[PDB]
Design an enzyme around this catalytic site. Structure first.
Site, PDB file in Angstrom:
ATOM      1  N   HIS A  85       0.845  -1.367   0.025  1.00  0.00           N
ATOM      2  CA  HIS A  85       0.095   0.123  -0.041  1.00  0.00           C
ATOM      3  C   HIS A  85       0.702   1.265   0.205  1.00  0.00           C
ATOM      4  O   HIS A  85       0.344   2.308  -0.316  1.00  0.00           O
ATOM      5  CB  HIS A  85      -0.966  -0.266   1.238  1.00  0.00           C
ATOM      6  CG  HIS A  85      -2.058  -1.055   1.000  1.00  0.00           C
ATOM      7  ND1 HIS A  85      -3.097  -1.138   1.944  1.00  0.00           N
ATOM      8  CD2 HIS A  85      -2.101  -1.777   0.035  1.00  0.00           C
ATOM      9  CE1 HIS A  85      -4.020  -1.983   1.398  1.00  0.00           C
ATOM     10  NE2 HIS A  85      -3.586  -2.361   0.205  1.00  0.00           N
TER      11      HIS A  85
ATOM     12  N   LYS B  84     -14.156  -7.563  -9.938  1.00  0.00           N
ATOM     13  CA  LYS B  84     -13.480  -8.425 -10.780  1.00  0.00           C
ATOM     14  C   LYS B  84     -12.873  -9.530  -9.706  1.00  0.00           C
ATOM     15  O   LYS B  84     -12.407 -10.783 -10.164  1.00  0.00           O
ATOM     16  CB  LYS B  84     -12.123  -7.522 -11.398  1.00  0.00           C
ATOM     17  CG  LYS B  84     -11.514  -8.224 -12.617  1.00  0.00           C
ATOM     18  CD  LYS B  84     -10.623  -7.204 -13.284  1.00  0.00           C
ATOM     19  CE  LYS B  84      -9.781  -8.099 -14.276  1.00  0.00           C
ATOM     20  NZ  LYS B  84      -8.495  -7.255 -14.762  1.00  0.00           N
TER      21      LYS B  84
END
Ligand SMILES: CCCCCCCCCCCCCCCCCC(=O)OC[C@H](COP(=O)([O-])OCC(O)COP(=O)([O-])OC[C@@H](COC(=O)CCCCCCCCCCCCCCCCC)OC(=O)CCCCCCCCCCCCCCCCC)OC(=O)CCCCCCCCCCCCCCCCC
Ligand SMILES: CCCCCCCCCCCCCCCCCC(=O)OC[C@H](COP(=O)([O-])OCC(O)COP(=O)([O-])OC[C@@H](COC(=O)CCCCCCCCCCCCCCCCC)OC(=O)CCCCCCCCCCCCCCCCC)OC(=O)CCCCCCCCCCCCCCCCC
Ligand SMILES: CCCCCCCC/C=C\CCCCCCCC(=O)OC[C@H](COP(=O)(O)OCCN)OC(=O)CCCCCCC/C=C\CCCCCCCC
Ligand SMILES: CCCCCCCC/C=C\CCCCCCCC(=O)OC[C@H](COP(=O)(O)OCCN)OC(=O)CCCCCCC/C=C\CCCCCCCC
Ligand code: HEM
Ligand code: HEM
Ligand code: HEM
Ligand code: HEM
Ligand SMILES: C/C=C(C)/C=C/C=C/[C@H](OC)[C@@H](C)[C@@H](OC)[C@@H](C)CCc1oc2c(O)c(OC)cc(OC)c2c(=O)c1C
Ligand SMILES: C/C=C(C)/C=C/C=C/[C@H](OC)[C@@H](C)[C@@H](OC)[C@@H](C)CCc1oc2c(O)c(OC)cc(OC)c2c(=O)c1C
Ligand SMILES: CCCCCCO[C@@H]1O[C@H](CO)[C@@H](O)[C@H](O)[C@H]1O
Ligand SMILES: CCCCCCO[C@@H]1O[C@H](CO)[C@@H](O)[C@H](O)[C@H]1O
Lengths: 48, 85, 42, 99, 62, 370, 365
Positions: free
Chosen positions: G187, G213
């Site tokens: 991140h 997805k």
């Protein structure tokens, strides 16, 4: 019923002796560091 | 060493600074130490000497600290003391 | 250079004595350095 | 004896032994925090020092000499006028919030 | 013109961090031996004649 | 790596005056790590089949090198855990720490999870207390209307406590402590938003000191005292806080005549035992713990701590004495006059918390003229 | 939020980026089926194998939870290998912290699956415990001591099975904590993408684009898992583990779980004890060296033809080693395996770094 009987007591003796040593020493370390605060002095000086 | 040499000679520029160096030096050293002597003293300082002299005065020594203003963030003395080693 | 300025800058007077010398007397001069605090005279 | 028990209680409570005034001991909620923010410099600075002095005594598990204890008869509410208004203002808003 | 014990302990052992650690390693191994031997002696004395090591000679031969 | 280890420890601001009563939080962290460490090592030799559970425990204590010390450290560590838990909760009630609502309520969840965890661990050696403790406690769920009994049999994996029960309990007891650890980290995160309360109940923002070195050394000193207490128990009286009946393998046909709960569950057991009604006792039991979640809503005093509140202090110690009374009663047979003393103590417990203390709070407010 | 919902993500990451979430799902799946199996499993050597058959025959739906756990471990490795391959091909390894934690994750999952396979105490369970722990015996002076210490005795026995249940029980939760750290470092940089070029000029929010997805990917993972569980639960397993452990006899065609075959082929190719163990360790640890071996001026292999050809040669080579690991130590497999083992290290240490330099030259930088 307790085959560990003699060994725990021998260990207990060592534990008491070690604590008799470590407790006052750590306590001394605690008071050493804390002395900075325990003897500190304050004063209030407002404008007037 | 080069910074110090430059500070020493550039400070003794003008009659006032020189006069003061005379008066104060006689009181402090009991004599006027000539630039050539300061040079010898400076020249002999090397990395080893700096390490040893700094260690002697700074290393694991208790400092005196003074703070004024918005100093909530000035470190605690113990923390300052541990920073000395 | 090696010598620090008389007054390091960052970003008082209450008596006559401390005020004497404050009045300007000559044109202004501004100095800037690599190693020394800036100054402005007069 | 209510006024009689009062002075007794005041001393039993004992915040006076740390040099605190009653208002220095109030639980700080949002109304109180706003009232403290509204205090004039001198009242705010004095409060800060009394609390600091009391926290210091508490850390040493000590108290002030008896002659320095806050006196019951001299303890006054410096915070009341401010807190009372803060509460009044919030109540007014709460009333308005009902349609 | 003469220091004290603590001043000497300071200069040679505690000042340098490398030496303050060697001191603890060494002191720990020495303390361990002396402490265990000492405490074991105290325990065995308090219990003299009661432990297997005390009466063992009577049955040994094996 | 630095930050959050750091600004979350090293330079964490702390009140200059927190007392020894503030040491229990770190002592609880240490009890948790101790239980986890001794627990894993015991789990390396323990088998959960009813035919071999009790045996595997004796094998640990008799043949595994130092198995006995690890075992008694785990058993007595559970006791130390509760001593600290109760001191920790007491500190919170006395000093008004419960006003930190999130921290407090998470704490209530922590208390319940440790109780459930300790319960399941006690079942593992499969001695007499293990078996009847499993039977009784799981049955508390049978008080739930409509599905209670179904829930119990589902938990048991059968119509009675048996193999399926012991095996799943080992699994639950194994994982719960790690869940407790994650919950405790959340406990601390919420606390860090506000920082700690202190004995005076007055904000300490004007006098904070860094957690290190002041409380790091104070916590180490506390840790040493905890270890001394633990080892005095392990090395000099390992069975003192235990029950002789658990040295007898589980017998499904016979409940020991003087069966009694682990000492740290005695006060709650006394309360449940005082009500001659099934559902009523179960509700009183649940409420004796859950009432802690109500304390914040019952706070009437204008002051946060009880330090400056004489009347509230007297009632606080009466509550502690009362819990001591209930603990004593829980260890006595259901006979006269204990049945009545226990009922009074049970009523007094809820009366002090729900009525007397909130009332003392208001009276003290009046005496101070606010 | 901001760790999920409004997390900025490249607009172009492909399906190769779905394996991270799929690994998270494999981990959760293993933990869930694992705990439920642990509610009925007993680790005593006299009853371990029995408790497993009891799970499959009498525990309600015990069979599906068991085969989901067994096949879930296989899906875990398929995903792990796809995940690592994506990283090598696209240069994701330049995120050093994330990558190295990933290497730790691979080793921990391997160790975890190894110990789980020992739990049913069948023949493969027993010999796997024997062989793998003995890898440590290659350590000079103290190796043998370490092995006996791990075993709790002079041979694999009860003490071993019981501690392995405990280790296998806790390690996945440790893996979960390590994976959270894996993501936190990620991140800090956000994801890489097929082009290897910064995607800061075209970021889209993770939700709803990648949440949907990832769900589609999760559905495909579940299909693959359930095709195995419901139609061929033993396809990826070994028949020999349906035979209880026999300490007096090692099956003649003993072979490792399929996901360990490539490494086993490498170790078997060296007729020296310490050498084989060092090659085994290095075949995995070399992943930590990839970043230092990056010579290309470009991050991804998308625009690098020569590098791509060598990348697929490496994949084909691992496929070769996997096949060889399943064959007897006989001619010509012994030699094919030795070549494949040498080719593996040669592609990674020499050929790929060299292709990187040549490609730079061809682009004039
Ligand atoms: C076993 C039970 C199970 C629980 C597990 C055990 C955990 C123990 C709780 C943690 C407390 C440990 C701790 O941090 O001790 C600090 C504390 C250190 O006190 P201190 O440094 O002297 O502080 C000075 C006072 O603030 C100022 O006080 P003072 O100047 O008036 O002097 C008081 C002091 C000295 O007075 C004399 O006794 C003389 O006496 C002591 O505290 C000793 O030691 C204790 O309170 C002893 C703990 C008792 C157990
Ligand atoms: C054994 C291993 C088992 C491991 C577990 C399974 C892991 C699965 C990985 C995740 C892949 C699924 C995914 O989320 O990618 C969506 C992936 C992307 O396809 P798309 O949504 O049509 O994107 C259009 C292309 O970007 C634009 O490209 P296009 O215009 O050339 O169209 C391509 C598309 C349509 O072209 C045609 O075939 C016509 O063909 C398909 O992918 C269908 O679709 C699939 O591969 C799954 C579709 C199944 C229904
Ligand atoms: C749960 C069931 C457990 C059974 C109960 C066991 C009974 C054990 C009782 C012994 C407790 C030891 C008490 C010794 C401390 C006495 C003492 O010093 O009190 C005075 C002193 C004065 O302090 P300040 O007002 O801050 O002023 C400072 C001025 N310098 O008060 C304190 O120290 C208050 C601290 C209280 C915290 C500990 C409370 C005892 C714990 C018991 C359980 C608590 C109840 C919660 C359980 C709910 C379920
Ligand atoms: C470890 C031991 C495991 C044994 C190996 C098993 C062998 C399985 C091999 C089958 C893999 C499926 C390959 C199908 C994908 C083919 C494909 O589409 O390739 C072309 C395509 C072109 O893409 P771009 O250059 O980005 O340009 C896009 C333009 N629109 O390339 C890719 O998709 C590259 C992605 C590769 C990632 C997956 C690699 C396969 C994994 C195998 C293991 C890898 C090695 C690491 C193990 C070290 C220990
Ligand atoms: C596994 C259990 C627990 C752990 C590990 C734990 C740990 C901690 C720690 C480390 C602190 C800071 C130090 C301190 O003040 O003690 C703390 C504070 C606190 N804990 Fe806990 N706790 C536990 C259980 C509980 C319980 C059962 C309650 C209450 C129902 C609770 C209530 C609190 C509160 C309100 C504070 C604030 C204290 C203050 O600042 O005055 N905790 N706890
Ligand atoms: C909150 C932490 C924990 C608590 C309070 C706790 C409590 C208990 C209790 C009260 C017992 C019975 C002790 C006795 O024999 O008299 C026990 C047993 C047991 N616990 Fe724990 N435990 C904890 C953590 C763990 C963990 C993390 C594991 C393992 C990973 C574990 C494994 C065991 C084992 C194997 C036993 C059975 C052997 C024995 O009775 O000593 N415990 N536990
Ligand atoms: C329990 C195992 C693992 C889990 C749960 C996991 C999970 C993840 C997740 C959730 C992502 C983001 C989605 C993605 O791009 O795929 C990610 C990215 C990544 N992982 Fe892993 N991982 C694991 C093992 C590994 C391994 C073994 C490696 C490689 C040795 C690794 C290297 C990376 C790198 C370099 C990225 C950045 C990918 C990019 O942005 O291109 N991971 N991982
Ligand atoms: C990284 C995650 C995990 C992996 C890769 C994994 C892998 C494995 C493997 C390969 C086996 C052998 C399966 C067989 O052929 O029977 C196994 C068995 C087992 N696993 Fe796991 N496991 C994981 C997590 C867990 C967890 C969290 C638990 C339990 C808390 C667990 C409990 C079990 C049990 C009790 C068995 C024995 C019964 C059986 O063989 O199915 N596993 N595991
Ligand atoms: C699968 C997991 C399950 C079902 C967990 C359930 C957990 C429930 C609670 O924890 C949250 C519970 C442990 C806690 O209630 C708040 C205790 C204070 C209850 C104390 C308790 O103990 C007893 C005990 O130990 C015994 O031992 C031999 C015997 C007992 O009577 C004969 C009792 C008993 O009559 C009570 C009330
Ligand atoms: C207490 C915990 C311990 C001791 C953990 C040790 C972990 C070690 C490694 O994981 C990090 C290890 C699993 C990993 O090496 C990198 C594998 C690729 C090794 C693969 C491996 O498998 C075999 C196997 O499965 C077998 O099954 C029946 C039989 C085997 O030969 C007869 C093997 C074998 O010859 C090798 C090399
Ligand atoms: C710290 C000293 C607390 C008092 C210890 C008594 O402890 C009690 O002893 C009984 C046997 O007499 C046991 O049956 C009971 O379970 C135990 O808690
Ligand atoms: C997903 C496609 C896998 C290819 C099917 C063959 O699979 C193989 O079958 C062998 C015996 O038939 C097994 O011994 C081996 O472990 C297994 O991987």
């Amino acid at each position: 019923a307790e085959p560990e009987h003699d060994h725990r007591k021998r260990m207990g003796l060592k534990m008491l002796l070690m604590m008799g040593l470590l407790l006052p020493l750590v306590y001394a370390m605690k008071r050493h560091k804390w002395s900075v605060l325990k003897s500190r002095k304050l004063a209030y000086r407002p404008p007037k | 060493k080069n910074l110090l040499r430059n500070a020493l000679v550039s400070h003794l520029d003008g009659t006032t600074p020189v006069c003061e160096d005379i008066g104060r030096s006689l009181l402090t050293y009991g004599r006027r130490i000539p630039l050539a002597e300061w040079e010898s003293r400076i020249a002999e300082v090397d990395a080893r000497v700096v390490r040893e002299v700094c260690s002697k005065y700074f290393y694991d020594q208790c400092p005196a600290v003074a703070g004024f203003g918005p100093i909530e963030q000035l470190p605690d003395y113990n923390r300052i003391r541990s920073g000395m080693f | 250079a090696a010598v620090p300025a008389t007054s390091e800058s960052p970003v008082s007077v209450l008596c006559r004595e401390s005020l004497r010398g404050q009045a300007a007397g000559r044109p202004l001069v501004a100095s800037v350095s690599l190693n020394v605090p800036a100054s402005v005279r007069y | 004896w209510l006024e009689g028990i009062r002075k007794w209680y005041y001393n039993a409570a004992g915040f006076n032994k740390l040099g605190l005034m009653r208002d220095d001991t109030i639980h700080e909620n949002d109304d109180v925090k706003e009232a403290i923010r509204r205090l004039p410099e001198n009242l705010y600075d004095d409060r800060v020092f009394r609390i600091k002095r009391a926290l210091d005594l508490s850390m040493r598990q000590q108290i002030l000499p008896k002659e320095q204890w806050t006196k019951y008869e001299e303890d006054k509410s410096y915070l009341e006028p401010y807190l009372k208004e803060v509460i009044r203002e919030r109540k007014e808003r709460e009333e308005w919030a009902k349609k | 013109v003469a220091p004290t014990l603590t001043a000497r302990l300071y200069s040679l052992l505690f000042r340098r961090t490398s030496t303050f650690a060697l001191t603890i390693v060494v002191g720990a191994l020495f303390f361990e031996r002396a402490f265990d031997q000492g405490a074991d002696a105290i325990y065995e004395h308090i219990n003299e004649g009661k432990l297997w090591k005390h009466i063992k000679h009577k049955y040994e031969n094996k | 790596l630095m930050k959050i280890v750091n600004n979350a420890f090293i330079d964490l601001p702390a009140p200059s005056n927190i007392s020894s009563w503030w040491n229990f939080g770190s002592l609880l962290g240490i009890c948790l790590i101790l239980q986890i460490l001794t627990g894993l090592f015991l789990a390396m030799h323990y088998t959960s089949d009813t035919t071999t559970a009790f045996s595997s425990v004796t094998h640990i204590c008799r043949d595994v090198n130092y198995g006995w010390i690890i075992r008694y450290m785990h058993a007595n560590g559970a006791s130390m855990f509760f001593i600290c838990l109760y001191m920790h909760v007491g500190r919170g009630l006395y000093y008004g720490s419960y006003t930190f609502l999130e921290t407090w309520n998470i704490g209530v969840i922590l208390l319940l999870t440790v109780m459930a965890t300790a319960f399941m661990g006690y079942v593992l050696p499969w001695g007499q207390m293990s078996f009847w403790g499993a039977t009784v406690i799981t049955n508390l769920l049978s008080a739930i209307p409509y599905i209670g009994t179904n829930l119990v049999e589902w938990i048991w994996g059968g119509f009675s406590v048996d193999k399926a029960t012991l095996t799943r309990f080992f699994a639950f007891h194994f994982i719960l402590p790690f869940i407790i650890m994650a919950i405790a980290m959340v406990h601390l995160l919420f606390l860090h938003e506000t920082g700690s309360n202190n004995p005076t109940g007055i904000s300490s923002d004007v006098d904070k000191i860094p957690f290190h070195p002041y409380y790091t050394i104070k916590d180490i000193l506390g840790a040493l005292l905890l270890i001394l207490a633990l080892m005095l128990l392990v090395l000099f009286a390992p069975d003192l806080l235990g029950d002789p009946d658990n040295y007898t393998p589980a017998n499904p046909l016979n409940t020991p005549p003087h069966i009694k709960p682990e000492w740290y569950f005695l006060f709650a057991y006394a309360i449940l035992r005082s009500i001659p009604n099934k559902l009523g006792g179960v509700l009183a039991l649940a409420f004796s713990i859950l009432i802690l979640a109500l304390i914040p809503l019952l706070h009437t005093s204008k002051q946060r701590s009880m330090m400056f509140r004489p009347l509230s202090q007297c009632l606080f110690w009466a509550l502690v004495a009362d819990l001591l009374t209930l603990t004593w009663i829980g260890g006595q047979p259901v006979e006269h006059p204990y049945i009545t003393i226990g009922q009074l103590a049970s009523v007094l417990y809820f009366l002090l918390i729900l009525v007397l203390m909130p009332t003392a709070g208001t009276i003290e407010n009046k005496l101070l003229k606010w």
